[PDB]
Amino acid sequence: GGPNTVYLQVVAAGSRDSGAALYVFSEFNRYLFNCGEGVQRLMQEHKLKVARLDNIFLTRMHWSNVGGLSGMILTLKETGLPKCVLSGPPQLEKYLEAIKIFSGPLKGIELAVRPHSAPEYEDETMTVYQIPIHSEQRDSSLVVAFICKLHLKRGNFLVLKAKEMGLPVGTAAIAPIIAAVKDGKSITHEGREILAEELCTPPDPGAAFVVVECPDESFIQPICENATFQRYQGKADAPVALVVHMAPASVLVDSRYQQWMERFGPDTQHLVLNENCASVHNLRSHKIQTQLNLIHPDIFPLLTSFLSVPMVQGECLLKYQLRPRREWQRDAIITCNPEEFIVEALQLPNFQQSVQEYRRSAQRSQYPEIIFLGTGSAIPMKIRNVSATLVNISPDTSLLLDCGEGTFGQLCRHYGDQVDRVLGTLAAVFVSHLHADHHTGLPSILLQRERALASLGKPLHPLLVVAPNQLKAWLQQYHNQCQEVLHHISMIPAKCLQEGAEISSPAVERLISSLLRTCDLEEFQTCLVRHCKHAFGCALVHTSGWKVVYSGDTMPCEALVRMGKDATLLIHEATLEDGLEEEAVEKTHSTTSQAISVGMRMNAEFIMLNHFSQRYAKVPLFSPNFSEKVGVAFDHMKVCFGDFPTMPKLIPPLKALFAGDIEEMEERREKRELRQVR
Amino acid sequence: AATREFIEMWRLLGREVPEHITEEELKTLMECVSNTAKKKYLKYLYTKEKVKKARQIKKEMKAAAREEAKNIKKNFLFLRLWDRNMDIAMGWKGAQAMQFGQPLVFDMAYENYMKRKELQNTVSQLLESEGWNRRNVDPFHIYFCNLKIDGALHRELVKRYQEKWDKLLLTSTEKSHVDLFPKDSIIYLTADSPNVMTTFRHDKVYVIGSFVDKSMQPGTSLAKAKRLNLATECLPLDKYLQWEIGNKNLTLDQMIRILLCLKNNGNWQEALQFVPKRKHTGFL
RNA sequence: UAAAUAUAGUUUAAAAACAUCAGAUUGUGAAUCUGACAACAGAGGCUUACGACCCCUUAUUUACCCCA
Ligand SMILES: *O[C@H]1[C@@H](O)[C@H](n2cnc3c(=O)[nH]c(N)nc32)O[C@@H]1COP(=O)(O)OP(=O)(O)OP(=O)(O)O
Ligand SMILES: C[S@@+](CC[C@H](N)C(=O)[O-])C[C@H]1O[C@@H](n2cnc3c(N)ncnc32)[C@H](O)[C@@H]1O
Numbered sequence A: 001g002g003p004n005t006v007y008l009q010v011v012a013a014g015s016r017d018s019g020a021a022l023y024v025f026s027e028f029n030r031y032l033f034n035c036g037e038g039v040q041r042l043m044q045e046h047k048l049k050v051a052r053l054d055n056i057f058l059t060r061m062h063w064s065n066v067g068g069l070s071g072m073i074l075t076l077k078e079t080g081l082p083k084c085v086l087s088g089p090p091q092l093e094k095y096l097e098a099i100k101i102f103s104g105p106l107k108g109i110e111l112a113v114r115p116h117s118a119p120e121y122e123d124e125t126m127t128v129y130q131i132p133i134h135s136e137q138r139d140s141s142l143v144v145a146f147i148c149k150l151h152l153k154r155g156n157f158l159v160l161k162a163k164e165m166g167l168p169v170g171t172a173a174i175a176p177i178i179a180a181v182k183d184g185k186s187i188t189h190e191g192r193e194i195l196a197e198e199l200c201t202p203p204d205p206g207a208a209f210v211v212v213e214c215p216d217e218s219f220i221q222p223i224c225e226n227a228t229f230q231r232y233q234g235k236a237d238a239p240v241a242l243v244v245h246m247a248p249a250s251v252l253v254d255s256r257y258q259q260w261m262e263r264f265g266p267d268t269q270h271l272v273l274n275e276n277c278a279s280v281h282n283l284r285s286h287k288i289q290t291q292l293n294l295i296h297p298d299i300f301p302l303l304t305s306f307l308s309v310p311m312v313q314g315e316c317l318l319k320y321q322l323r324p325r326r327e328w329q330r331d332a333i334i335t336c337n338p339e340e341f342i343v344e345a346l347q348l349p350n351f352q353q354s355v356q357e358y359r360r361s362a363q364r365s366q367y368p369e370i371i372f373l374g375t376g377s378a379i380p381m382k383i384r385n386v387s388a389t390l391v392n393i394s395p396d397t398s399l400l401l402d403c404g405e406g407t408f409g410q411l412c413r414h415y416g417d418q419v420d421r422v423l424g425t426l427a428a429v430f431v432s433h434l435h436a437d438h439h440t441g442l443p444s445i446l447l448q449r450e451r452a453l454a455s456l457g458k459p460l461h462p463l464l465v466v467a468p469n470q471l472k473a474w475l476q477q478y479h480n481q482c483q484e485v486l487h488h489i490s491m492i493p494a495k496c497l498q499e500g501a502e503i504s505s506p507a508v509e510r511l512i513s514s515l516l517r518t519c520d521l522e523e524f525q526t527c528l529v530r531h532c533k534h535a536f537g538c539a540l541v542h543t544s545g546w547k548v549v550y551s552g553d554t555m556p557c558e559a560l561v562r563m564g565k566d567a568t569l570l571i572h573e574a575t576l577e578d579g580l581e582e583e584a585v586e587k588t589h590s591t592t593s594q595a596i597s598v599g600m601r602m603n604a605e606f607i608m609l610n611h612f613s614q615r616y617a618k619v620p621l622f623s624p625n626f627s628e629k630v631g632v633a634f635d636h637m638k639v640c641f642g643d644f645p646t647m648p649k650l651i652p653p654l655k656a657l658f659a660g661d662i663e664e665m666e667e668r669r670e671k672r673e674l675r676q677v678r
Numbered sequence B: 001a002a003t004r005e006f007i008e009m010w011r012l013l014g015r016e017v018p019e020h021i022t023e024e025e026l027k028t029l030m031e032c033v034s035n036t037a038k039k040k041y042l043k044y045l046y047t048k049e050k051v052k053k054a055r056q057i058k059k060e061m062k063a064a065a066r067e068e069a070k071n072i073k074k075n076f077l078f079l080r081l082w083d084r085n086m087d088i089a090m091g092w093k094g095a096q097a098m099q100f101g102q103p104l105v106f107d108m109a110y111e112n113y114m115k116r117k118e119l120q121n122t123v124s125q126l127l128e129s130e131g132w133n134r135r136n137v138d139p140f141h142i143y144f145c146n147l148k149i150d151g152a153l154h155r156e157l158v159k160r161y162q163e164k165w166d167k168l169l170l171t172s173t174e175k176s177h178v179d180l181f182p183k184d185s186i187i188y189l190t191a192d193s194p195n196v197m198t199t200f201r202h203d204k205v206y207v208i209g210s211f212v213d214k215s216m217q218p219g220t221s222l223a224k225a226k227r228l229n230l231a232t233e234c235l236p237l238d239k240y241l242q243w244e245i246g247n248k249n250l251t252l253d254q255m256i257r258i259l260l261c262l263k264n265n266g267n268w269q270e271a272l273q274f275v276p277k278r279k280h281t282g283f284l
Numbered sequence C: 001u002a003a004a005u006a007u008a009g010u011u012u013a014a015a016a017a018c019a020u021c022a023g024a025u026u027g028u029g030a031a032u033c034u035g036a037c038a039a040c041a042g043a044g045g046c047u048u049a050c051g052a053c054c055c056c057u058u059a060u061u062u063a064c065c066c067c068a
């Protein structure tokens, strides 16, 4: 008779990194409110199974809310979830159609959008109401508020009470009647028509919680004059347990919002998710980076971390229990103590000695710096995100090689308060191809760049994006149907920057000139690499002379080798491991040996490997080949040209730190060989 | 204590609780800090008294059947003193083993990691292990190492063995195995060892961890065997058996019986016959 | 990642059988007697109760290969 443990848990606490996301749990059904960029990872990292989700409720049609939405569908498709319902704005329908431009047919899973126009969603657990709120002077004006009312729960049978009046206990015998006792139907036993209300515990009327998003000042007035809210405000028979406010600080302080919050009972708890939290979300990233920081502080830098109505400031994995008690549960709160990480690392077998001996061994321009924001493929993990490399040409110029869901968050945890200047520094974005891990982070960067330009006072101008043509279509659809983003983009087709490319329209030619002038580059070439078509690698040549080459997802490519001749740095991929050559040919990827061999054909002074799989995530399997020239990227790893000689020396310390994970990866290799034999 | 009155209301609800609880077990009811943990404890006592009753009822049933049989109801070489004589014979072998026999070490350094439930089971397993060693044609010289005199495991061993504890033909010492034997000749057995056991070596001392981790702590035996720089080995279960279900960490009694027949010039098949059959589906 | 799966002596069954320990000078059913030990992976819940139902941890197997 209804779920008996229902709680709300905060996936994302509303920081600039993560946005806001709210996870609702019951015995029967699991819900998630919103789906920002990086909810997928925040959830996997914290062992919240997405495979069980019924509905994803989205409060607004914004990339903040739906950034990671295209992300989960891919993944929970894999888990093999037959159906998932997207509840929120009606424009979600067109969003799904836009997603399919790059995401494939999205068959195998059924996505049914149920908008706020639809009748209510009834479940085992709750009945959910959608309230459409329209701002005061494609819809930018629409937000949705959710009132979720739990079903009536049958009262617990009091066997003691039955036997008190002399009614038979009959744990098994009167069990059919016990069901009637639960139902509260009058009982014929005891020689009289005794109502079962007295036999069972009082049935709770049901708790309701409200998830209301007020993006800014516009929406305050509409919320405070909402007829539907006023029904649940002050009406004695209908109390509201919790309200989850995803409004910023400015909205909440307003007298009008304060008054509205007061109008819910004094017993109502209020939860706030906004930028004021700045709690730690990605614990394992913080842990690893703190330990990596021991090895080399420069190459592995530290990640930056931080009235009328009684409000509870959202923290990650904060929990409000609805049944069987109403209380704040703070047990699974994310605690990050850097000192603890250090002690744990120092206690490892050989890490202390390897690090110490590195320092004994220790005792070119500072630009460019290559920041590796994320170095993994496909599904994001605890330690590696999806693809992003930031090239800082100069103190005042930067260029973003690929930008995937999670990328802005990586940038934001990398730079903290300094992310504003970095965003304003950003000149170009390059997208290698149209796999959903190379471009899905772009809309966040576009929107956040706008926010950064305003803060620094700089004029707002479009961001130069070098990407395939197919990206425009995805963005044109998102602009047309969902949200305006195309004013942020001056896109140069990747085919225009190819060697021996036909002169495009004068617009594109003029854009190309601005690309070179802004980034201070002498050349920016692209070539067609061998990755399921319309996939590009780029070469940056700087006026100083140095060349850096990005492969992207590819196989061993002659064109890339011809292009990147005598590169200073190559960034190539090692998605597959050596011995999985038959995997590489079909996925159109590289192995570590193949990636290195490409480097050696180019006479690259140094080679970095990225886009590893999760199969080799915690530590890519270090092949013995070419120590001095080959390096391995982690997230938040800074590489300069000065650091080329230290990179070889980092392997002995790195191997010691990730020794645990090396063993397991080696066993997988051995087990595979045994499986191949058997 | 309130626990005596506490259980009364649980009895009324019929949550599988036994008739009576001894004052000793009342103390162990206080230990449980959870309703769930109490439930698991009460069920254990519930099934314990049930089997006590059933055995007793089957006992006096047999007794009544035996007495009625009595009512209904030569040149020997030997008197019937076989059980007595076998115990003496096994004694003589045990003394010989203590002088010449190959060492085999049970490490008793695991009391900290075990709860009360797991601790009794370890002693039960140790009892069986020594038995199979006793009854063997070529017994190991059994060492109890890292056995505190006043420890829980020592106290439990004394209870189960009674006066026989002093008279057991095995060596118990508070000392470690690294103190008693050369460090090179110690091979620590654990399922987590990367090194597979290829053949039984008669020159080696084998250390078996007296550890029943129902609450699984992986690698603890390995961690001990690394802190002291010892060689570790694992059984070739993967090689010889088609593993389907179950834990690869065998019980002590199984371990010794595997070793005993390995020592006695058996092959791995004859040895792995002691591996629980529910865990594998034949030899490959 | 997903699925089933997990009997701490062994099986079977949905509790028994066979084992284990201590005592025994046994007139050849000691084929017994008197005791000891009794925990279907682990932790926490829900419920009138349950080995069902939920959750977590570990482990096994298999499938997947990572978002194909
Ligand atoms: O969530 C899983 C999954 O993403 C990945 N994983 C590991 N093996 C497989 C596999 O065979 N198939 C698939 N599809 N996915 C696989 O690993 C995740 C679980 O990792 P955990 O965080 O639980 O553990 P971790 O590897 O971090 O442990 P350790 O090796 O550091 O101890
Ligand atoms: C159940 S195991 C204890 C498990 C413990 N977690 C560990 O790490 O060993 C009891 C003892 O039996 C031995 N053992 C059990 N299975 C083994 C196997 N497959 N190979 C080697 N030794 C084994 C080990 O000596 C072990 O300490």
Ligand SMILES: [Zn+2]
Pocket: A376, A377, A378, A387, A435, A437, A553, A611
């Ligand atoms: Zn990729």
Ligand SMILES: [Zn+2]
Pocket: A433, A435, A531, A553
């Ligand atoms: Zn790709």
